[PDB]
Amino acid sequence: SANNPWTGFQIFLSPYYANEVAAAAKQITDPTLSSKAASVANIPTFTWLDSVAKIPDLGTYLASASALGKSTGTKQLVQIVIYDLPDRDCAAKASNGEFSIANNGQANYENYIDQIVAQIQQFPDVRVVAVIEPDSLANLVTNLNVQKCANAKTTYLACVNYALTNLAKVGVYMYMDAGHAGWLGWPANLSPAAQLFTQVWQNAGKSPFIKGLATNVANYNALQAASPDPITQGNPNYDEIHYINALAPLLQQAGWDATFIVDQGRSGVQNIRQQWGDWCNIKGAGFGTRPTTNTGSQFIDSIVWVKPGGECDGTSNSSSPRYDSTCSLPDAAQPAPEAGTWFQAYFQTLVSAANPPL
């Protein structure tokens, strides 16, 4: 499109990921690998607002970005993930996240959005790009047979609408999560997905700040695979570029010339999964293509690192109340700590297996 949110801006580097990376690199013993690891702190990632507890951090990042821009003559851009729906991750094993539909979850979520908007409003010289709710709307395409998803459908739609509508009022550029090629990219899922995303865009007033969709968030697919990963058999859309090429014209016909961003933060190593749906701490993953607006596609505004590699996807300990058995599969790195916490051995392998090399 004419207006790529990233062009002309310098991305604010997460100091939280930077602190995780610095502490991680000091523990890596090979000096050459340690220095490569430390350099990861210079690679832009998204900050996950996975709880109200993360909102004060957001405020600090906005103010720091504003000052850094003034100190360097640049316009700064802060990258966030909105990730706190009630009954979050409805098709996953075990609940997670602080809000529940049964306990005023939607109202609590809208207060979470209000707190985020109240921060962003204070820093108009900082641009914000937000990924809207990974692992949400995609469930409403394929997973309505999951009763928790069926029962969450109206709440997910209302909450995503509230986020889009209110973040647009403060000029946030937004990409709704849209799964990945092995979820919504199956040819038969493309039209149902387009119909849902278009309805969501319409309900939020077709705001021009709703730029499009984010794909492969927290996943491992190739953007452009050299050959199809065996997990993809039956799906001609075996990588993200095939998925996006197939989906984008359906949105265009609805009057939404949508653009896309694609997570590649853990995509450096292909052909590492036994089944396409295996998502938790996949063993042998490597850091992938660094974020860039040189995307190779008319539809793609940026390759991005949304999920910060090294932060765990979930525990392998079956005694944890947060335990998801996906995190114990033969292709999941084990033992693994609780979701979001640092997984040092996994990070070291992400560095060692980075492609392109660090």
Are residues 222 and 270 in contact, defined by beta-carbon separation less than 8 angstroms? yes
Examine the residue annotation and report whether 324 is marked as an active-site residue of this protein: no
Examine the residue annotation and report whether 57 is marked as an active-site residue of this protein: no
DSSP for 69-82, written as a single string? HHHHT--EEEEEEE
How many Å apart are CA 277 and CA 346, to the nearest integer? 20
Solved using: X-ray
Resolution (A): 1.0
Amino acid at 293: T
How many Å apart are CA 191 and CA 68, to the nearest integer? 44
Marked catalytic residue, from 84, 87, 135, 324: 135
- The helix (run of H) or strand (run of E) holding residue 262 is strand 259-263
Q: Determine how many CB atoms are found less than 10 A away from the CB of residue 72.
A: 10
- Measure Cα distances from 75 to 121, 123, 183 in Å: 16, 12, 36
Per-residue buried b or exposed e for 289-319, using 16+ beta carbons within 10 Å of the residue's own CB: bbbeeebebebbbbbbbbbbbbbbbbbbeee
How many Å apart are CA 151 and CA 145, to the nearest integer? 10
How many Å apart are CA 26 and CA 22, to the nearest integer? 6
DSSP for 15-27, written as a single string? HHHHHHHHHHHHH
Looking at CATH, the fold of the domain delimited by 1-358 is given as TIM Barrel (3.20.20)
Are residues 349 and 284 in contact, defined by beta-carbon separation less than 8 angstroms? yes
How many Å apart are CA 110 and CA 159, to the nearest integer? 7
Structure tokens at 198: 């278009």
Chain breaks in the chain (C to N over 2.5 A) after: none
Are residues 81 and 95 in contact, defined by beta-carbon separation less than 8 angstroms? no
Marked catalytic residue, from 89, 229, 263, 324: 89
**Residue 220's closest CA among 238, 195, 197, 199?**
238
How many Å apart are CA 290 and CA 310, to the nearest integer? 15
Marked catalytic residue, from 87, 263, 301, 313: 313
Q: CA Rg, the chain, in Å?
A: 19
Examine the residue annotation and report whether 89 is marked as an active-site residue of this protein: yes
How many Å apart are CA 285 and CA 312, to the nearest integer? 13
Q: Which residues are annotated as a binding site for substrate?
A: 48, 50, 180, 183, 219, 279, 307, 311
How many Å apart are CA 166 and CA 178, to the nearest integer? 20
Are residues 12 and 64 in contact, defined by beta-carbon separation less than 8 angstroms? yes
Cis peptide before 321 (omega within 30 of 0): no
Are residues 241 and 204 in contact, defined by beta-carbon separation less than 8 angstroms? no
Are residues 271 and 222 in contact, defined by beta-carbon separation less than 8 angstroms? no
